[PDB]
Design an enzyme around this catalytic site. Structure first.
Site, PDB file in Angstrom:
ATOM      1  N   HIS A  63      -3.428   6.619  -1.419  1.00 38.91           N
ATOM      2  CA  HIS A  63      -3.666   7.757  -2.830  1.00 38.91           C
ATOM      3  C   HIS A  63      -3.646   7.295  -3.752  1.00 38.91           C
ATOM      4  CE1 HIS A  63       0.692   8.810  -1.921  1.00 38.91           C
ATOM      5  NE2 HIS A  63       1.182   8.822  -3.718  1.00 38.91           N
ATOM      6  N   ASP A 205      -0.234   4.217   4.311  1.00 37.90           N
ATOM      7  CA  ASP A 205      -0.232   4.409   3.070  1.00 37.90           C
ATOM      8  C   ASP A 205      -0.923   3.349   2.031  1.00 37.90           C
ATOM      9  OD1 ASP A 205      -1.253   6.455   0.711  1.00 37.90           O
ATOM     10  OD2 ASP A 205       0.184   7.548   0.325  1.00 37.90           O
ATOM     11  N   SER A 630       5.118   6.468  -6.258  1.00 40.09           N
ATOM     12  CA  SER A 630       4.495   5.830  -4.833  1.00 40.09           C
ATOM     13  C   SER A 630       3.423   4.489  -5.604  1.00 40.09           C
ATOM     14  CB  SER A 630       3.045   7.567  -5.603  1.00 40.09           C
ATOM     15  OG  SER A 630       3.318   8.814  -4.568  1.00 40.09           O
TER      16      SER A 630
END
Ligand code: NT7
Ligand code: NT7
Ligand code: CL
Ligand code: CL
Ligand code: CL
Lengths: 695, 697
Positions: A63, A205, A630
């Site tokens: 992402h 991810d 992240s």
């Protein structure tokens, strides 16, 4: 429980060692030498990444690299759906507008900034938090032409603890960062929006980039002559895996926290911010869902808009659950009462006065803040025709030279962007009727944007008729209506246009509310400087971490699951079996990559499976993370890479105000699953060979 | 596999139960020649289980089992369904019309007797061996001349087991004066409501209390003000010791049906026809209903119960199909039949292989008919409300064709029209549901297989389903109240004979009955082949680890208090607490409202001797016992036979357990007896009920 400054490692080291840390302090962070800190980067301004090879290979989330994967995707080569695996360095794709920032040096400049600040005079000056003023101080300390004498380097001073501590960062920025590898979106975003904020999680991810530089390893913009960077430090990859209770730590760039909110600020965050966002988005989403379920073409056009609305809606539900059930308000009240009692004992009333100024400012701005969230959630983001075209001053002072056609071409361009392939006027009218009905019930006539007064005055309270009239008579109500205006344009027609008047009126009110609310931030900020100073003087800069501010922090904890509710336990680790249980071929979010399904069937897990033969996917830990974390590297007790942080469970979103030891977890993709996907799905052996993989 | 065992099988199972933790003596649990714990178990109101818990005939069962009785005594002035009911004296206990409790007084193996009687065969294909009428004639012959009049209260019944390879005669004692004694408010009794149906973890206090009354001698007697509480042979002691993970637990009750001896072809049929059609058709029906209920609050009130009633078997079918897809049910039935076929080949007896082949051939031959039957039943008979609109009888059509019997026929038709178009019926919602259900049905059923009236969709309406449905309501006498009244003023048989709604309803019921009549003959060869199949299975592997299919007779099952992992990285423990009820509280959702007295008990921790060792208040537990429908209200016993809970549900993951028990997923959902006593005590304040129970430390 904290997001600690690198300077606080010395003070936390003994606790980390007792919790399982095996590496020497200066191997993790050394203020005057090379350390593991040197392998951490701020990836593209809002994510974290990590260097994993002596040739500048970088791992971050899928992402985080999503925009770059999408920008290189075409109908012929759809990297977003199929994945991308450059089989040679020359095939890695450059990216425009990308950066990776290294934190070369960090220095405490508190005394210097506090001495400089003594020359201010106005006691209420906000220069102590001004990026412009702090940059002038950073430049003064670094030197006149520092960036010219040290190319690729830059300095920045940031305030911490509400203005009680200042740090100067020497940053090295690289802008040639190339896309190397990415799994298909079916792996990179397996849960898609359904599993967002969810543990257990089965999402791979990750994405892979490479930092390029000039011949000397110095920052350089994209050039075909650029060579991969040989970094001073990179992470070793561990294949030892994780077990329950293992020590884990993260370094990264958490963006924001509100650890020093008063109890009144928690009440405000609940009753205004969260309740309005929840109520308004539930209305908007309900109408959108009804329309998407009834028309397959509406589902295609509105899926992304629906998903974008749901993300912060879910965050607000999670935060309100913490306020209701975890005693956030009470714990902030106890924190401030304890400081007030200690100040009364010492004869210093400034801390009690500071808490009172915050409470009084919160109470004074309540109605304005409620009106702001109501219009922002209800209209600015709730109704698409609020962002319809508004004729600029250059366009009206052209329609009434013959550049009338230039004005119409610019207005037409904006109309085509508003009424694009994904815009439905019928869906928008239905959403607006429900959103405005709620808004008109909550905002009194005297507080309405001027055009909304027409609902009572001209349309006899009929919201449907008011909305119908906006589209029936507006030049932006349909393509035919725009074209009829564009043939015979007059400023008179635009000045009386019901959609233009609506959009102008709601933006006027939104800006007026913002301008009236902005001054209330400063007394709270100034009082927080005194409040946090008292808290630090009373209980120490030991268990009280400074609020996140997009600067490098470390956090430590253990690989541990939790009990979400009575009689239910979520373990610390998910497996490939969990991906297969979730497979639904007729649901795009839960499709399983055929090559991955075959790997699972044949158990072709190689050296990546756990001791029992099961293939790990993700794990969770008691580390304290937030947005900005992240892609953060997750380390072993030895500092070896064991995973990448990619999310946090909804139960822990209240952790930005109060860490929740029994619920809050960082959601991490297991590095063994990353390597399994690079190897068996991507077939990109050269990436495995350049990493330093430890048995 | 795990088993719903006959009481006769307790002897051969006892040593395994003892090794699993059972401490009580065999004959204290069941003795055919005396008093045992079996004597405290009752079949409650024909389809639930209950248990006697005092020497004054007090009975415990589920709240959903006593629901109709609680509702029948509820008024605006005294709403017992909402607030609960606690009779503070025996004289205040409320009688119930049409209630019964059945005791299993004696059970006797009559296999030799029935098999000798059956030898008088006129037809080897006779189904008398399974006929309730024929078996009742044999039961009456054995019991004696006028047994019912000579032994008031007692009755005799013979049932077939193992596909007709074993027969048992039951001597039953029935009591019909069973009074409502106590019930928690619905907020406790049905806390999860339909949201938590088939769900574990579960936080529902699913219990209600009755009392058996009898004459002065303890003999059955219908309701009379002179009736006295029954002093029973046996009653359960209540345990307050609670449960821990891995504790031995056992249940006695009346499981209704299982299909443990399905062939692999019957599993495929159950999946591909029964379940897939029910799933597909109910998903269509429920989707339209939900859209209409969400858009109109008045439609939500009118259709909530119809929507919930459709969802129950829809969820069961999803759960059963999950077991077929993921737990190898088809494969395990295939292995069972292959093993018998291989053993039959060694014994030199081909009859077992021939029997499995007859079942496969019958299943294959009836496929299209069975598909058409489920399609019309799910799609129209249950799917569309105007399928059950009024159809004028032969006598009603005759009355309308020169006497005052015309006004009598119109009053009867009007009564049926008012029942069809009641306060909960929406013609607009029904037209929307019918358009979607018929579109799916017309896609699956070819023109030559359609109910005659549905042929008009292609022939008269050019394939427009909406126009066909619109026309039914526009021109029908039952399309609106005004249209019925205009017909009732000038009624003619001609108008009813050409009525589009009457023709639709008649046509779909004609097809439904024709399909049923054509499918019925296929049951008999399967039944006869199953008698040979199960005989072989029993002769090969013994009546030791192969239980007889459930048939609404008394059975026992044993296992342990144990949770399970429903999916990757998720574990559901063995016990829920009062804390879980509080986590689920939602005051603006009627299903999850928490009783104020109960919320206060939790806040004050007024748990007394009912809390666990750690001070937590238990609510429910789950166990590896093997249960099914009919087991609601069953007593759950300790290793010592003391009551530790009442069974009230089973998790959706274990619904495939009617075909193949699932050791790692299937669990009985049980209300903890400590929570039952907490609610009687702290919510009901009914101390006299606690005092009459024998509570052991
Ligand atoms: C915090 C918050 C608020 C509202 C909704 C969500 N997500 C869900 O409930 C959906 N997932 C997937 C399917 O249903 C079970 C859970 C979350 C996370
Ligand atoms: C087998 C099957 C099929 C479809 C639905 C259900 N039940 C539910 O999902 C209902 N609720 C929703 C939220 O609360 C927890 C369960 C089941 C059990
Ligand atoms: Cl470097
Ligand atoms: Cl034979
Ligand atoms: Cl299983």
């Amino acid at each position: 429980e904290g997001m600690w400054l690198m300077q606080q490692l010395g003070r936390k080291y003994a606790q980390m060692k007792e919790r399982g840390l095996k590496m020497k302090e200066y191997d993790l962070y050394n203020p005057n030498g090379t350390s593991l800190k040197d392998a951490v980067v701020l990836f593209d301004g809002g994510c974290t990444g990590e260097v994993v090879s002596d040739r500048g290979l970088v791992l971050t989330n899928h992402h985080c690299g999503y925009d770059m994967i999408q920008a290189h995707s075409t109908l012929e080569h759809n990297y977003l759906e199929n994945g991308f695996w450059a089989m040679r360095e020359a095939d890695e794709l450059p990216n425009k507008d990308i950066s990776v920032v290294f934190i070369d040096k960090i220095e405490d400049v508190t005394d210097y900034v506090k001495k400089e600040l003594k020359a201010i005079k106005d006691p209420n000056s906000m220069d102590y938090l001004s990026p412009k003023y702090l940059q002038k101080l950073a430049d003064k300390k670094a030197g006149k032409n520092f960036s010219a004498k040290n190319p690729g380097l830059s300095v920045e001073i940031k305030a911490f603890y509400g203005g009680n501590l200042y740090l100067m960062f020497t940053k090295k920025t690289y802008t040639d960062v190339r896309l190397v590898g990415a799994p298909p979106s079916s792996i990179g975003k397996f849960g898609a929006d359904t599993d967002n904020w969810i543990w257990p999680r089965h999402t791979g991810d990750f994405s892979i980039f490479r930092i390029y530089a000039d011949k000397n390893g110095n920052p350089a913009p994209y050039s075909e002559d650029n060579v991969p960077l040989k970094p001073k430090r990179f992470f070793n990859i561990s294949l030892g895996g994780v077990q329950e209770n293992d020590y884990a730590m993260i370094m990264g760039f958490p963006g924001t926290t509100h650890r020093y909110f008063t109890a009144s600020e928690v009440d405000e965050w609940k009753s205004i911010d969260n309740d309005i966002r929840i109520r308004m988005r539930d209305i908007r989403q309900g109408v959108m869902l009804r329309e998407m379920l009834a028309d397959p073409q509406i589902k295609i056009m509105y899926s992304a808009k629906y998903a974008a609305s749901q993300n912060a809606y879910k965050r607000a539900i999670g935060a309100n659950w913490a306020i209701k059930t975890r005693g956030l308000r009470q714990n902030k009240q106890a924190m401030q009462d304890r400081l007030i009692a200690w100040g009364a004992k010492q004869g210093t009333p400034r801390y009690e006065e500071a808490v009172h100024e915050i409470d009084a400012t919160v109470a004074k701005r309540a109605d304005l803040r409620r009106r702001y969230w109501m219009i922002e959630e209800g209209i600015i983001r709730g109704i698409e025709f609020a962002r319809s075209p508004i004729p600029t001053e250059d366009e009206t002072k052209a329609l009434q030279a013959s550049a009338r056609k230039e004005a119409i071409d610019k207005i037409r361009t904006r109309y085509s962007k508003f009424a694009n392939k994904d815009y439905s006027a019928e869906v928008d009218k239905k959403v607006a009727v429900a959103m405005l009905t709620e808004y008109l019930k909550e905002i009194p006539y005297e507080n309405l944007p001027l055009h909304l007064r027409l609902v009572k005055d001209r349309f006899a309270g009929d919201v449907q008729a008011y909305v119908d009239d906006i589209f029936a008579r507006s030049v932006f109500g349909s393509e035919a209506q725009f074209d009829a205006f564009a043939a015979v344009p007059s400023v008179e027609k635009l000045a009386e246009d019901p959609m233009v008047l609506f959009a102008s009126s709601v933006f006027d009110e939104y800006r007026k509310l913002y301008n009236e609310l902005r001054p209330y931030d400063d007394p709270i900020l100034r009082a927080q400087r005194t409040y946090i100073a008292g808290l630090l003087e009373m209980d120490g800069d030991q268990d009280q971490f400074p609020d996140a501010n997009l600067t490098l922090r470390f956090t430590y904890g253990q690989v541990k699951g939790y009990s979400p509710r009575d009689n239910v336990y979520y373990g610390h680790q998910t497996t490939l079996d969990g991906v297969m249980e979730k497979e639904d071929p007729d649901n795009w979010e839960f499709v399983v990559d055929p090559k991955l399904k075959a790997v699972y069937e044949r158990k072709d897990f190689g050296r990546y499976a756990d001791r029992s033969g099961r293939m790990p996917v993700a794990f969770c830990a008691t580390t304290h993370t937030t947005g900005g974390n992240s892609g953060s590297p997750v380390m072993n007790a030895n500092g070896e890479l064991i995973g990448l942080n990619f999310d946090r469970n909804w139960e822990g979103v209240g952790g930005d105000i109060q860490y929740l030891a029994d619920y809050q977890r960082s959601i991490i993709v297991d590095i063994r699953y990353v390597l399994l996907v690079i190897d068996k799905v991507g077939g990109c052996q050269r990436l495995l060979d350049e990493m330093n993989i430890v048995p």
